[PDB]
Structure 1
Amino acid sequence: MVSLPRMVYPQPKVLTPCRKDVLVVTPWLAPIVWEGTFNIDILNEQFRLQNTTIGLTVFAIKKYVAFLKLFLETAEKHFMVGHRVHYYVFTDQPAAVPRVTLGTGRQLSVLEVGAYCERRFLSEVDYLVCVDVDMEFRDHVGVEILTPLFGTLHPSFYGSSREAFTYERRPQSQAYIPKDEGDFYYMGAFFGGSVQEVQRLTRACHQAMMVDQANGIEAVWHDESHLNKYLLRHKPTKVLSPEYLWDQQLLGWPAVLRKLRFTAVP
């Protein structure tokens, strides 16, 4: 909206790719976010000028409440630092949520479950980021991921052929995807977008899972199977590389990953 201020940074080189070892744009022209593809100063300026607020949601039930301290402490060091952040922790144990110190412009809401409106999200944040709690941030996760709708490449399948993707393969399921279809295998543990697009996705997923239930079938990878069907039919406007969802104990640290940003806890 507003003009960016004068900024000094390296001139982009038209005849010089940022990365030659990986695909940085999908065939529907959505950027695939890898280290080296973005200038975070330009993006930070663009998003701050819009006074962007990012909501980060996590479900922590039963034993999972134990992961909240590290998750939030590391989010404080690496997630959207400099921007407005609203954490939404859905838990069955409100009194067990750790007292974590937050930087300025950041807040946390605890929502008790068994149960208990979506309209709140529309008025409180601009973007929603949905992740799992048994994780920790190890490096920068910022506005470079923000877009109307994004999915993240599952770390175990980014180099796999589509026939190997663990999509739901039974025609009887609403999440069904035949062997000759599919762009990528997205992990269900890290997706997001504008509030409107995220609610559209979760609403579609919920409806599809109910149809399957009534039909006596459960998709091979549950919610993740449906997320993949949804993103196959509604292409994400950005796709995050595995830098954003990794498991070093299980997969090591490949040369193609210049940074390990959000990882599974051992």
Structure 2
Amino acid sequence: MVSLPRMVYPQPKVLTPCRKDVLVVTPWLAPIVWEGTFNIDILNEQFRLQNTTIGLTVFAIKKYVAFLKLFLETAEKHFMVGHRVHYYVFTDQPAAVPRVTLGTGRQLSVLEVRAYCERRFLSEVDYLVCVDVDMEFRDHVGVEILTPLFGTLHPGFYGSSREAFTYERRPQSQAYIPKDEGDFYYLGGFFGGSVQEVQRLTRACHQAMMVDQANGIEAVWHDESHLNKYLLRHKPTKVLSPEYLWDQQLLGWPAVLRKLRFTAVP
């Protein structure tokens, strides 16, 4: 909207690729976010000028409440630092949520679950980032991921052919994807976008799962299977590289990953 200020940074090189080892743009022209493809100073300027607010949602039920401390503490160190952040913790144990110290401009809302509006998101945040709680941030996760709709490449299938993807293969399921279809295998543990697009995705997933339930069938990987079906039919406007959701214990640290930003907790 408003003009960017004078900025001094390296001139982009038209005849020099960012990465020659990986795909950095999808066939529908959505960028694939890898370290080296973006200048965070330019992006931070663009989003701060918009006074962007990012909501981060996590569910912590039963034993999972034990992961909240590390999750929130590391998020404070690496997630959207410098921008407005609103954490939404959905739990069945409100009193068990740890007292984590937050930086300025950041807040946390604890929502007790077992039932209990989506309209609230529309008035409190601009973007929603939905992730798994048994994780920890180890490096920068910033505005470079913000876009109307984004999915993240599953760390165990990013180099696999579509036939090997663990999509739901039964035609009786609404999440069904044939062997000759599919772009990538997105993981259900890290997705997001504008509040509007995220609500459209979750609403579509909810309906598809209800239909499957009625027909007495459960997708092979549940929510993740439906997420993949949705993103196949509604292409994400940005795709995050596996840098954004990795498991170093199970997958190590490949050369193709310059940074490990968000990882599974052992």
Q: TM range, normalised to the smaller chain?
A: over 0.9
Offset at residue 260 of structure 1 (A):
0.1
Map 1:1-266 onto structure 2 (within 5 A).
Answer: 1-266=1-266
Offset at residue 31 of structure 1 (A):
0.1
CA deviation profile, 1:44-101 (whole Å, cap 9, x unmatched) = 0000000000000000000000000000000000000000000000000000000000
1:87 alignment partner, SS class: strand
2:225 alignment partner, SS class: helix
2:201 alignment partner, SS class: helix
2:198 alignment partner, SS class: helix
Rounded to whole Å, the distance in 2 between the matches of 1:234 and 1:124 is: 25
Rounded to whole Å, the distance in 2 between the matches of 1:24 and 1:210 is: 36
Rounded to whole Å, the distance in 1 between the matches of 2:181 and 2:61 is: 35
Rounded to whole Å, the distance in 1 between the matches of 2:169 and 2:16 is: 41
Rounded to whole Å, the distance in 1 between the matches of 2:116 and 2:53 is: 23
Offset at residue 173 of structure 1 (A):
0.1
Offset at residue 19 of structure 1 (A):
0.4
Offset at residue 246 of structure 1 (A):
0.1
Rounded to whole Å, the distance in 1 between the matches of 2:115 and 2:83 is: 30
CA deviation profile, 1:138-185 (whole Å, cap 9, x unmatched) = 000000000000000000000000000000000000000000000000
Offset at residue 25 of structure 1 (A):
0.0
Rounded to whole Å, the distance in 2 between the matches of 1:99 and 1:22 is: 41
Offset at residue 218 of structure 1 (A):
0.1
TM-score, reference length from structure 2: 1.00
Offset at residue 108 of structure 1 (A):
0.1
Rounded to whole Å, the distance in 2 between the matches of 1:238 and 1:122 is: 21
CA deviation profile, 1:196-231 (whole Å, cap 9, x unmatched) = 000000000000000000000000000000000000
Rounded to whole Å, the distance in 1 between the matches of 2:115 and 2:75 is: 26
Rounded to whole Å, the distance in 2 between the matches of 1:70 and 1:263 is: 12
Rounded to whole Å, the distance in 1 between the matches of 2:36 and 2:160 is: 23
How large is the RMSD of aligned CA atoms in angstroms? 0.1
2:157 alignment partner, SS class: coil
**How many aligned positions are there?**
266
Rounded to whole Å, the distance in 1 between the matches of 2:212 and 2:117 is: 25
Runs of at least 5 residues in structure 1 that lack an aligned partner in the other structure = none
Rounded to whole Å, the distance in 2 between the matches of 1:53 and 1:230 is: 25
Offset at residue 11 of structure 1 (A):
0.1
1:229 alignment partner, SS class: helix
1:176 alignment partner, SS class: coil
Rounded to whole Å, the distance in 2 between the matches of 1:75 and 1:236 is: 24
Offset at residue 112 of structure 1 (A):
0.1
Matched residues, percent identical? 98
Offset at residue 37 of structure 1 (A):
0.1
